Design a protein around this nucleic acid. Structure first.
Ligand SMILES: [Zn+2]
Lengths: 239, 119, 37, 186, 99, 251, 51, 49
DNA sequence: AGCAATAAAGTTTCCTTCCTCCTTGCCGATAACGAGATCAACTTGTTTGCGGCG
DNA sequence: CGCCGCAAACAAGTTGTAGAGCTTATCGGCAAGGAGGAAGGAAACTTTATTGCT
C-alpha cells in the first residue's frame, strides 16, 4: 500500500519488509499448541497486519527502537488470534496458570502429590473456589464420531440418549381431558365457561375477562375451585 | 443381453457420425426413420460389447449409478448436463420408497403409468 | 408430497439467495455456560 | 435391477439352436433337459420328415421330450432370450417356464434378480500322439480338405476338420479333433 | 431380545440396535433382493416407511391397529431429503419435477 | 439452511481434480497451468491490447515485467479466479461449435476426432442444459442447519459436536480478515496469502485430503468433510437408506 | 399383571396369524420363509428339521 | 505420567483380562501378535504370513 | 342455599436501584536469540485411464 | 505410434465386547461499559376465611 507521501511509503514498506524475518523468528517457537500452531500462516498474516498498525503510529521522539515499539503489537495480534479461537474466559485461564505454577512449585517443595488441603492453603482463598474451578477449567470438549474401540463396532453417535422425547398418549389424554373440561363446565356459569375455555383452549388471556366483567375476580376464584371439585368426581391415571 | 445395450454408429444423418449409443435407440430411430419417414437419412451400425461394471455406470439413470460406486463422478457428469431420471427401476422406487414397477404393485404402477400418459 | 420425477441442475447464486433466509457473520455458536444459542 | 417381463408374447422372430454338450465323452446335458419348457423357434419336425408339432411355439414339457426322444432328433431352435425384441422388457414365451412353479410365466416378473442370486449362492462352495476309437460306429468328417497320403490313408489338408464317431443310427457317440495332415489309419 | 416400539435415532429418527438400548433389528439389501424375487411390493413399502422412518406413518398405523384397523398410508422418508439437503450444500440445484 | 456472502470468487473441485475436468477440458488448457494460476504463482494474459501477445498466454511475474515495462497499458494479465471468470464469461459457444464441426471434416484422425467430439458435446451440454459456465465460480454458498451438524452436552456438561462447524469458522475468520485488510488498501502479498488460505479452507470443507494434505484435529485424524456423508458403505445409500433398523422385530 | 385372560386372548389372536423368519446371510430367496405360529414354553424356537 | 497412563489405558495391546477360567488367563497372557505399532494389518496382510 | 363484607395472607410483578461484578475493546517501553521438518507411514493390489513420452 | 509412469480406487454380512483422555500452553493493565443481581421492599393483585342478609 501507500500514503499521501511516497518516500514515507517506500521507507515504510522497506522497514515493513525488513522485519518480516522478525515476524518469523519470534513466531517460530510459538509452536506445538492448538492446530493453528501447526499452520503458521495465520500467524504471518496477523503479524503483518499488526506491523502495519504499529507502523502507522511509530513514535519517534521517544527514541525507542521501532522493532521495540513493534514487538508489542506483534504479540498482541498473535495472542488476539489465539483468543479468537478459544471461547472460554480469560481470568479462568489466569487461575489455571496459577494452579499450574503453584501446584508444581509446591509439589517440588514437598516431593509428592495430591494433598489438596495444601492447595487450600497456598491458594488460601477458599476450598469451594477451586472446587468449582476444577469443573470450570479442567474439562474440555470432545467430538462425536469417535469409533468405539475394538475395531470400529460402532461410534458414539449410536450410544446416545435423550430426555425430551415424544410420547403419544399423554397429548391424547390431555386433549381428552380438554373436552372433559368443557364437558364438566358446560353446566356452570356463562362467562367462566368462556373464561376457562378460551384461556385453556386457544391459549389466550385470563384476566382479560376479569377486566371484561369488572367484579374483582373473586367469583372467578370460588367458581374455579368448584370446577376443580367437579373434576375431582372421576378417575384418571398418568399420575 | 444386458451386457449388450449399445452400438457404435457407422453412417450419419440423424445424429453424430460414430457417437457411442444404445443399439436399442438405434433400432428405434431406424424403426421410425428408415421407414417411410425416409428411405435413409439415419445411419447404420456396428454392435458393441461392454463389461458389466462400467455398463452399470454407463446408464440413463444416474441414481443407481450414484448408489454404490464412483457416485461423485456420475454426479458431476450428469449435473453438468441437466439430466433427469424417470423412476422406472426398482432401486429408484425403493430409495424414494414408492411401489415397485413390478410384482404385486405392477398393476398400480401401470395405473400410474397410464396416469402419466393420462396427465 | 406426491411428485413425478427428479431433476438436477446448477446452483445459480440467486438461487442461493432465494433459498437462504439470512446471512451469517461470526464463528461462534453459543455461550460456554448458558447452554444457549 | 432393471429387468422384468413386460409383455405376454413379443411375436418376435427366431433365435438360437440347441445341440447337445456330449463332447469328450457321453451326454452331459440331455437335449431333453435343455428343451424342458423352452418355446420353439418355429414349426419343427421328425426324422421321418414333415411332422409339425408346434405352430412356432409350445410349452415343451416332458410329454414332448418323451414324444421326441422316441425319435432321434438332435437339434432345435428357440425364440431365445437374446432374440426377443421388446423395448424395455421381454416376452414370457422366449423365457419358457418357471422352474420353481412348473408352468408358463405370467407377465410381471423379475428375472436377472433370480439369475444373479442363483449363480452367486453356489459360488461360495465352488472353488472348493494318437486318436483311438473305443467302440463301433459310422465316421463323419465335415468341412474337410484332405488327401490320400502316399501310404494310401487319409491326411488332412485343412485345419477345419475334426473326427467323429457317429453311431450306426446317425447320432454322435464321440468327437475328437485331428491335426492338419495327421496320419490316419482309415 | 424382542422389541415392539420405543426409542429412536435423532439425526435420522429410525431405531437403534442393541438389547442394552432396546434395539431394533436390521433389514439388509439381501432381504430386499429376495423379496423382489418374489415381488411383494407392499411389504417393502411398510418395511421402509413405517417401521423405519415415516413418523406420521408409525403414528397413524399404531392408531389404526388399536382401533382394529389393519390398513396403510405412506409418506416420504425424511432420510431422503437429508441427502437433498446435503447435495444443495455442496453447491447444486438438485430439485424435483412435480407431477 | 442459510448462507454466506464471499468477498471474492472461488472455484469448485469436483469440477476440477476429478477425471476429465470440464473446466479447462472446455478451454483447451491443461491443469498445471491452471493450478499455477489459482495457487497464485503466475500471471496470465486476459486480453492483449497488443496482438504482440496472445490470449491464454502464461506470464511468470519476471517475464511479465518485461511486457509490463515495455507497454504497461496495452495488455491485461492477472492471476486468479476473477481472471478465469471473465475469461469463461468472454467466450461464445456457437462459433466454436461450428468451427469444430467444420474442421472436424478435414482430418478426423481418431484421437483428434475424439477430442473434437468431446468438446463439441460439452458445448451442446452448456447450451441445452440452459446452464452458464459463469456459474462454475463460487461467490456465495449455503449454511447447513444445526440439526445436521449439531452440538449437544454430556452427563458431566461436556460436549460433542460436528467438525463441519470448525471448517466454517476458519473460512469466516479469513474472509473477515480480508475485509478488514481491504479497508486499508494494504500491500498485496498478504492479500494473496489471504486468498490462498481462503480457497484452501473452502475445498477442504468440501473434501479434505484430495488436493492438499488433510486437516486434522489434535488426534492427528481428519476433520471429516461432507462427501463421506454420501460415500463408501458409510454413506446414506449403503448404511442408512437401503439398509434399515426395524421395530416390531426380534430374534 | 399377566392374568389368565391375557393368555386366552393371546390364543384367540395368534391363530391364523403368520410370521416371517430370517437366517443370515440371505443368499437366495429361500433364506427367509413364512410360517404359522405355535406358542411354546421356553425362550428358544423350535424349527421343522427339513429346512 | 501422561504417556505412561496413556498406553497403560490407550494402547490396542492393553486389555482387560479374561477372568472366566484359569486357562483363559494364563493363555491370554501367553498370547502373541504382530499387530499394533511396528506391525501389520488384516486387510493388507495376506496368506503368506 | 346464593350473595357480599371485612380482614388477613400471600403473592407475582416489576421495577427500580445501588451495590458489585463482569466482560468488550484498546494500547505499551531496556536488547536479541532462528526459515519449519519432529514424530508419523509402511509400501495392499490389480485394473484401468490419461499424460506424457518417445 | 506404443510404451511408461502415474494415479485411482473397490475390497461379505449382522450380532455383540467396554470404557476415553490430551504434548500442550496461550499479556496484562485500563476503562467504560453494559448487563446482571441482589437487596429488601411496595404494591397490584390476588386469594382465604370469618361473619353478615335474601
Ligand atoms: Zn419376447
Amino acid at each position: 500500500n501507500s500514503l499521501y507521501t511516497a518516500e514515507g511509503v517506500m521507507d515504510k514498506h522497506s522497514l515493513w519488509q525488513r522485519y518480516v524475518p522478525l515476524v518469523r523468528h519470534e513466531a517460530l517457537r510459538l509452536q506445538v499448541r492448538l492446530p493453528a500452531s501447526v499452520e503458521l500462516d495465520d500467524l504471518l498474516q496477523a503479524g503483518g497486519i499488526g506491523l502495519l498498525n504499529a507502523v502507522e503510529r511509530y513514535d519517534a521522539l521517544q527514541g525507542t527502537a521501532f522493532t521495540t515499539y513493534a514487538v508489542q503489537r506483534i504479540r498482541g495480534a498473535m495472542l488476539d488470534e489465539l483468543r479468537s479461537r478459544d471461547w472460554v474466559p480469560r481470568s479462568v485461564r489466569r487461575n489455571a496458570r496459577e494452579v499450574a505454577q503453584a501446584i508444581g512449585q509446591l509439589e517440588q517443595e514437598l516431593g509428592r502429590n495430591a494433598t489438596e488441603t495444601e492447595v487450600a492453603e497456598r491458594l488460601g482463598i477458599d476450598i469451594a473456589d477451586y472446587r468449582q474451578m476444577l469443573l470450570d477449567t479442567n474439562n474440555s470438549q470432545l467430538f462425536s464420531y469417535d469409533e468405539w474401540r475394538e475395531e470400529h463396532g460402532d461410534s458414539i453417535e449410536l450410544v446416545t440418549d435423550d430426555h425430551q422425547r415424544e410420547n403419544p398418549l399423554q397429548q391424547l389424554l390431555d386433549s381428552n381431558l380438554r373436552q372433559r373440561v368443557m364437558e364438566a363446565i358446560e353446566t356452570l356459569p356463562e362467562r367462566e365457561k368462556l373464561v376457562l375455555t378460551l384461556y385453556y383452549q386457544e391459549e389466550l388471556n385470563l384476566k382479560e375477562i376479569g377486566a371484561v366483567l369488572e367484579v374483582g375476580e373473586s367469583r372467578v376464584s370460588q367458581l374455579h375451585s368448584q370446577a376443580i371439585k367437579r373434576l375431582r368426581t372421576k378417575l384418571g391415571k398418568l399420575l | 443381453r444386458q451386457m449388450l445395450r449399445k452400438a457404435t454408429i457407422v453412417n450419419a444423418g440423424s445424429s453424430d457420425f460414430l457417437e457411442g449409443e444404445q443399439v436399442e435407440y438405434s433400432r428405434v430411430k431406424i424403426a421410425n426413420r428408415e421407414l417411410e419417414a425416409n428411405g435413409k437419412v439415419g445411419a447404420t451400425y456396428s454392435r458393441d460389447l461392454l463389461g458389466i461394471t462400467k455398463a452399470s455406470l454407463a446408464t440413463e439413470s444416474f441414481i443407481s449409478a450414484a448408489s454404490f460406486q464412483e457416485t461423485t463422478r456420475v454426479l458431476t457428469e450428469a449435473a453438468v448436463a441437466g439430466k433427469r431420471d424417470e423412476l422406472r427401476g426398482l432401486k429408484e422406487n425403493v430409495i424414494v420408497g414408492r411401489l415397485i414397477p413390478a410384482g404385486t404393485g405392477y398393476a398400480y404402477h401401470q395405473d400410474r403409468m397410464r396416469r402419466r400418459a393420462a396427465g | 408430497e406426491e411428485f413425478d420425477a427428479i431433476k438436477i441442475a446448477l446452483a445459480s447464486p440467486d438461487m442461493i439467495r432465494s433459498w437462504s433466509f439470512g446471512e451469517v457473520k461470526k464463528p461462534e455458536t453459543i455461550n460456554y455456560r448458558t447452554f444457549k444459542p | 435391477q432393471d429387468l422384468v417381463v413386460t409383455e405376454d408374447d413379443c411375436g418376435t422372430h427366431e433365435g438360437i439352436m440347441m445341440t447337445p454338450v456330449i463332447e469328450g465323452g457321453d451326454v452331459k446335458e440331455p437335449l431333453r433337459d435343455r428343451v424342458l419348457g423352452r418355446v420353439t423357434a418355429e414349426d419343427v419336425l421328425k426324422p421321418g420328415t414333415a411332422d409339425i408339432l408346434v405352430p412356432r411355439n409350445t410349452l415343451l414339457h416332458e410329454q414332448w421330450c418323451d414324444l421326441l426322444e422316441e425319435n432321434s432328433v438332435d437339434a432345435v431352435k428357440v425364440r431365445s432370450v437374446v432374440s426377443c425384441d421388446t423395448d424395455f422388457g421381454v416376452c414370457a414365451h422366449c423365457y419358457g417356464r418357471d422352474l420353481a412353479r412348473g408352468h408358463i410365466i405370467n407377465k410381471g416378473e423379475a428375472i436377472g434378480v433370480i439369475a444373479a442370486q442363483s449363480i452367486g449362492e453356489p459360488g461360495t462352495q465352488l472353488t472348493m500322439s494318437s486318436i483311438q476309437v473305443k467302440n463301433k460306429g459310422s465316421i463323419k468328417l465335415s468341412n474337410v480338405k484332405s488327401v490320400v497320403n502316399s501310404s494310401g490313408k487319409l491326411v488332412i489338408t485343412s485345419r477345419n476338420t475334426e473326427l467323429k464317431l457317429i453311431d450306426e443310427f446317425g447320432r454322435t457317440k464321440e468327437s475328437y479333433k485331428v491335426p492338419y495332415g495327421a496320419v490316419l489309419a482309415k | 431380545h424382542a422389541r415392539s416400539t420405543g426409542s429412536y435415532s435423532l439425526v435420522t429418527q429410525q431405531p437403534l440396535g442393541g438389547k442394552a438400548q432396546f434395539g431394533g433389528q436390521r433389514f439388509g439389501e439381501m432381504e430386499v433382493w429376495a423379496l423382489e424375487a418374489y415381488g411383494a411390493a407392499y411389504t417393502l413399502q411398510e418395511m421402509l416407511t413405517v417401521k423405519s422412518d415415516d413418523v406420521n406413518g408409525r403414528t397413524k398405523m399404531y392408531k389404526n391397529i388399536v382401533d382394529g384397523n389393519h390398513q396403510m398410508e405412506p409418506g416420504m422418508p425424511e432420510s431422503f431429503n437429508v441427502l437433498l439437503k446435503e447435495i444443495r450444500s455442496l453447491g447444486i440445484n438438485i430439485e424435483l419435477e412435480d407431477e | 439452511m442459510g448462507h454466506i456472502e464471499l468477498a471474492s470468487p472461488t472455484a469448485h473441485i469436483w469440477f476440477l481434480k476429478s477425471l476429465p475436468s470440464r473446466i479447462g477440458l472446455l478451454l483447451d488448457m491443461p491443469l498445471r497451468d491452471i493450478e499455477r494460476v489459482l495457487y497464485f504463482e503466475s500471471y496470465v494474459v486476459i486480453e492483449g491490447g497488443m496482438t504482440n501477445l496472445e490470449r491464454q498466454q502464461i506470464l511468470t511475474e519476471e517475464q511479465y515485467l518485461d511486457a509490463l515495462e515495455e507497454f504497461g497499458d496495452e495488455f491485461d494479465a492477472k492471476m486468479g479466479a476473477e481472471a478465469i471468470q471473465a475469461l469463461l464469461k468472454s467466450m461464445d459457444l456457437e462459433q466454436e461449435c461450428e468451427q469444430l464441426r467444420e474442421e472436424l471434416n478435414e482430418t478426423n484422425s481418431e484421437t483428434k476426432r475424439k477430442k473434437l467430439t468431446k468438446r463439441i458435446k460439452l458445448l451442446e451440454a452448456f447450451v441445452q442444459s440452459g446452464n452458464k459456465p459463469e456459474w462454475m465460480i463460487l461467490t456465495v454458498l449455503p449454511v447447513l442447519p444445526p440439526d445436521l451438524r449439531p452440538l449437544v452436552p454430556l452427563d458431566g456438561g461436556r460436549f460433542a459436536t460436528s467438525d463441519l462447524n470448525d471448517l466454517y469458522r476458519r473460512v469466516i475468520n479469513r474472509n473477515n480478515r480480508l475485509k478488514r485488510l481491504l479497508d486499508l488498501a494494504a500491500p498485496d502479498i498478504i492479500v494473496r496469502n489471504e486468498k490462498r488460505m481462503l480457497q484452501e479452507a473452502v475445498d477442504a470443507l468440501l473434501d479434505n485430503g484430495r488436493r492438499g494434505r488433510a486437516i486434522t484435529g489434535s488426534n492427528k485424524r481428519p476433520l471429516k468433510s461432507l462427501a463421506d456423508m454420501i460415500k463408501g458403505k458409510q454413506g446414506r445409500f449403503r448404511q442408512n437408506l437401503l439398509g434399515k433398523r426395524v421395530d416390531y422385530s426380534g430374534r | 399383571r399377566e392374568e389368565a385372560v391375557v393368555w386366552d386372548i393371546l390364543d384367540e389372536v395368534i391363530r391364523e396369524h403368520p410370521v416371517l423368519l430370517n437366517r443370515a446371510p440371505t443368499l437366495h430367496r429361500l433364506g427367509i420363509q413364512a410360517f404359522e405360529p405355535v406358542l411354546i414354553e421356553g425362550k428358544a424356537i423350535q424349527l421343522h428339521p427339513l429346512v | 505420567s501422561a504417556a505412561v497412563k496413556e498406553f497403560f489405558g490407550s494402547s490396542q495391546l492393553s486389555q482387560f483380562m479374561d477372568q472366566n477360567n484359569p486357562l483363559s488367563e494364563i493363555t491370554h497372557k501367553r498370547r502373541i501378535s504382530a499387530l499394533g505399532p511396528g506391525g501389520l494389518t488384516r486387510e493388507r496382510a495376506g496368506f503368506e504370513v
